[model samples]
Target: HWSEKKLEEMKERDWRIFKENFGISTKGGSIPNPMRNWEESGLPRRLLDIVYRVGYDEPTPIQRAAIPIALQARDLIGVAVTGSGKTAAFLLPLLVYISEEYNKNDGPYALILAPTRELVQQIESEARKFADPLGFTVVSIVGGHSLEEQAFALRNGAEIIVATPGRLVDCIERRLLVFSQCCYVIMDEADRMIDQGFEEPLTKILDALRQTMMYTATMPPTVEKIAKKYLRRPAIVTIGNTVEQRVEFIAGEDKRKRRLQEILNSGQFKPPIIVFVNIKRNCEMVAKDIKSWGFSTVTLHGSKTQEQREASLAALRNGQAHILVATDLAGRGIDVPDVSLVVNFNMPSTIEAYTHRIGRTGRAGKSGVAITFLGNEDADVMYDLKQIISKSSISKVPEELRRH
Candidate 1:
């Protein structure tokens, strides 16, 4: 009745079956067969309970492919767009490593570096759900929090440390934490960190760490450089097609907001909309303006404290707020389900960022919509936009935006 023997006999066949079924492609390492269920994946019983507690019964595409590879103790490069479950892909392995070594800690056994405080916090949140239950302490070190408090958490023997590179470097300088025993390292959103000029600090962090893994929505040249430098013959796992992004775009500004208002009034665009802006000021401004117009909204940005970020995210997820105004800080690695629509109040700096922003919707096989308000400043990306629209099965190149 278990089918364990049948499954074991068909390991090779099952690997191929998983690839075909999920459209998964891999290179340069062993492919641990995709898990049919959480319990069958070889994780401890307590960890399975934690997984179920978080409401994940089935693995997402990236989770299916990368989790297996990670569990094998081989380094990995997990490539998938936003909302593709990249968090669990690495976190599962992180928790496994830390929990297994729970009683043997010289210091924190794991290090996860993210680009923003919000993302670091989000990772810490997810880590706690699994690590805490297994008697592992997960601590976060990010900007805006008190250094002494963070130092205290470090001194308390956190098994897993999730941090931003800058703050982590500061802690290292202050002799508040020691990472010599950190064998498991993860660079979540490696591309964005490099893009924001955190490369020096990241270089410093990774130079001393062992068994590194990098997860990113996009692997630009900078990301590629880091992968080649940090990862040793890593298992490269890519899920979904880079060219075939399932998103649509629209053009406007004042007209865009008015149209959104009309759509909300008519119940057309629907609730749980995520509006992406480029800056912190715009996040508060847009949320305020929308709330003044009788729309329930919340804002998230780099400037917000941890409590503010948590409350804002909670409001959006719990239906207390129908809309969320955020900067690129929320553009990658944040997943809120049933996001019926995504709006780019300001155009992202590049096509990749645009894809990640719009990807908030149309996730996990659910169809959704995205609207972008383009202006003269976005002219530089019009050709790139034109290419994406032409390639998309659902998106269209608004004739006005076709002039680039």
Candidate 2:
């Protein structure tokens, strides 16, 4: 007999509170309940044994929400950050399916594609933890490694493959791997790969459509676009936190931030950057510009109360927001790490103010670059700013940093 206690199936009202507590959110026609335990998850007994040995006491929020949806062999998009249960969230389900079902295959039946070699290694390591104990084979394919060695590994027979897209495509072309019998696919950081202008058209690799699959990103919504293109009525599972790009044209809206879009597209400048403004008006204006360039932008100014300001800061601190636009209100007493860039939309009137404004970044002696826009109105700060750097000769001052 299956007891509801182990199942933890909740009524609609109960689910609302449960999800709120765990920061889990799901939407679909009739999504399944979050599984609180390995036993309740309905995974194979052997897989459960492996989980027990692995010592995963409880399923993570993403695992709780995603594993059930995945067991049904449906398409799923899991919005989860790194160091979460993302690997197990996808792997556990695939292991269950691979263990139970048999399709004629020389190569792996399931595929996991990430952006970097480091991530590929990490995913393979996680895959081995469970798949190995169950007698399922896991192989990793990454660039800069000998193809002959890798081909033999695949030729030997594997049930799962962890790979970066570049190497995976080569295997596909070399005819070392085939997806004809493959039915499960995992694409991690789908947005990051896209942002870097991935050459491999993933759709071709994903040509086998009937495959139940999983897609994940802690980044942003280009994942949404990709999911929609390939997924058929997939279940949506969001954890911890929560748009599309704006292409709307109004008769009269500001678009003076053309250069902002160029910088955003560069993709070289990673997020957690801060932009300082002279007033709340510029703060809001720059917010619009940053978001227009498809950044996850947050804003803070004197106008907003603690309730709103903290929410903005929370997203920044959580890495959900890439760009922060703020006035002097946040210049003091606010600290965030790894801030790679700082932009002053308008110069501060005093060096003390400038010091604090630029200080939001370059925290912890990590070294950061700060850029300020100076106008004739900023005549007050030119003397002060230049004098602060005037005597600097080493790598200190650029000719135009003082002039331009």
Candidate 3:
């Protein structure tokens, strides 16, 4: 029997104006009605009320279109420029798809794979807001945190697991989590940003039927290739962008600690600072040096225990720690606003990773500073780095790095 919502129809004019008003368009199937009003959608009442209580007056354009299509267990690809409710677009349908009672014995009937640790945790937080109240357990599996704690969370059982590919695959191999009962997978960043490791779990472990959803701001040909291969008559929901989404150096090898301390002591760079080092041992050594110099410090690295990691975060965010010394483990994820300055005690190997590291500062359209120390081995990335900051609209390239 039809769910009836899928069979519900409205006038062509009704669809036309609504699409026009929101700059939305869709393709690849008979998509369901936009959740112009969520009350009209067939998703759970509690979730709808939770949304209202959380204060979303109306569905964002992506949610309006993707929610109902996904509710039918149809495969989906969701597109929106940057900010248009990509999270809720998939999350709303995901809940209905796996509406099961909370049980400690059930482990991840649903899976979400995102690129960065930050977004993975962010999505988990968003899911918990509704899922916790509705009796679902969601956990995050991001590497560079603690695997023992993650294993414990998985052992305790979770209905939804939000993770990056590496840790998820690691857990799967260790048999900490399994896909035998999982029925849904959301690849949150669909811009061909997916890791190659993700294919095995889907094609191999998932031998039975499972609904797949890929969400992103733009579609690449590779994504289309995957859509064709994996999606069975997938529905695509889109809300085109009306606006744009937006937006260094010193050298030292052995002398780096002194250079970093000099920058930290300067008044121009305020507290709530982040210092990026290249390895886990550097995280400890750098923070030790900062602490020895009478600065309150915390460290986030691959070796820290889960409780230690959480304590470092709390300390930094609550002003108990004036500085955070870390590896790239803390680089691409987490938001610590008012990070007035960033020091790259060592340069990240890739420009993309470097951008994420420096991005810790200069948030909220406010000005910030980042200082970098270059090692001799940095020649590999200097070409791209030169291309990046050489023509900075604000700062000039250092003479040492300019020709490289």
Candidate 4:
């Protein structure tokens, strides 16, 4: 049996451990004990075994502290850098909660909202890795997919539904899906969702939830507003720096193809490159340009069909493509493996986009590099860009940026 006194003692010890090691801090609500290894984290044996079997030997800082709070069924606002195992922080506990409390039903028991279709797919994939073994069904509801197909999945009963807010709202409004039975609501990349214009849809979606958990790399005011509106006395957990210090940046002029070739040939940055452009058409053009240089590359954008997008992401992940040209759609939510470099074909306008763009690499404690092609069009964002460049130990502050 679980004892409150014993659990409290463990939480105190774990809290101290995180503070001393990772400098993790928490406020409001009960802090779940930080975990070093999965086994000692109070998870069910089955879940723990699956977690380790999936190759997670230890909990990252966010996972260490956030999982416990989530498992305790507390509304939580989790702020941690991208790739700090934030996925497992929410998923692990939600899996446990669902397996213990929910039954096989016709309506979704849990709802997870992400900003993009790719992210909706990614979350569902991860959810299946653990939930499948427990007989829980995970379904993704997003724009590119068929409404009829999504409705079928919902009507047949999915224990966990990962969706993009817009499509989920459509389904809800059309009576194709229902959230009346939904107990858990999770917003991954919560801030990005708001920025990408999901506020109205999210407002509608959040109305039916029993509990809410929000996770973001940065807690911008938009995210704060959501937490204040929906979450009730939530626990706030902040861990580590949002920007990866190991990532170095370089500011350059246009002529991205030549610059990319130089960067690749310089031996300073390697393959598995992600090039972020600002437009869908630019994504295709950049990918074409990179391929013209005799390098394997693929393109991803919202305009591409779901099949095309999946193929592009697959080619990148499976080594068929060494370079991926994408718009801000790829900036959030999916993590490609061993991406040694990120190239900004067009400079992102906001700090959040910039952070998420560079964050594609330098992930999971790996050192990586980013090169940005800044131009006159990006002048408005120069002030924030200058601050980011100035703070970088390895990056040089560009002259024009310095003027701001």
What Cα-based lDDT does every candidate model obtain?
0.72, 0.67, 0.70, 0.72
lDDT of 1 by residue, 1-404 (tens): 33433454564434455565676656534346666667777777778887888899888888877877787768988778768888987887777666454455557777889898899999889777776677658888776767677667643667778888987887676776687788888888887798788888888775353578888877766778878977887777777552223333455555666765765677766678788888777678767878888989876654554356556666777789898877775535445655877777788777888876665564344446776777776778778877676666454444554466
TM-score of every model versus the real structure: 0.57, 0.56, 0.54, 0.56
Model 1: residues with Cα > 4 Å off, grouped in runs: 1-14, 99-106, 207-209, 242-404
* Regions of model 2 farther than 4 Å from truth: 1-10, 101-104, 218-221, 242-404
State the lDDT at 92 in candidate 2. 85
- The worst-scoring run of ten residues by lDDT in candidate 4 lies at 242-251
TM-score of 4: 0.56
Backbone clashes for every candidate come to 0, 0, 1, 0
Q: Which candidate number has the best TM-score? A: 1
TM for candidate 2 is 0.56
Which digits, one per residue and each the tens of the lDDT, describe model 4 over residues 1-404? Answer: 54433343454333444454675666534344556567678788988889889998877888888887777768988877677788878898887777665454577888888988888898889888988888768888776656677656633668788988887888787886677778888989887798899988888875563678988877666777878988887877776463343333345555566777787677775667777888777778767877787889876655555356556666776788787777775535445655877777777777778876776564344446676776666778767766766676454435554454
Judged by lDDT relative to the true structure, which candidate is superior, 1 or 3?
Answer: 1
User: How well does model 2 score by local distance difference test?
Assistant: 0.67
Worst 10 residues of 3 by lDDT: 240-249
